[PDB]
């Protein structure tokens, strides 16, 4: 740790953290997406209803 270790350690930690945070974004939007798609599959059109 001549701070080369510190920047590589923070780089690996930030890679893990950025993967998990993009995962949280993708997971919440996928919940949004497939809830919307289920609602579309169970929603008949306007003229029909």
């Amino acid at each position: 740790d001549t701070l080369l270790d510190k920047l590589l350690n923070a780089d690996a930690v930030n890679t893990v953290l950025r993967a998990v945070k993009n995962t949280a974004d993708a997971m919440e939007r996928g919940l949004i997406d497939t809830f919307l798609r289920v609602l579309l599959r169970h929603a008949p059109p306007c003229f029909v209803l």
Binding site: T2, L3, K6, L7, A10, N14
Partner: peptide, 20 residues
Amino acid sequence: EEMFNNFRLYYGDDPERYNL
């Protein structure tokens, strides 16, 4: 000092809005 400034500015003073 130069080394801690490599960690401070050349990583980014804010860990948000970017990461150098």
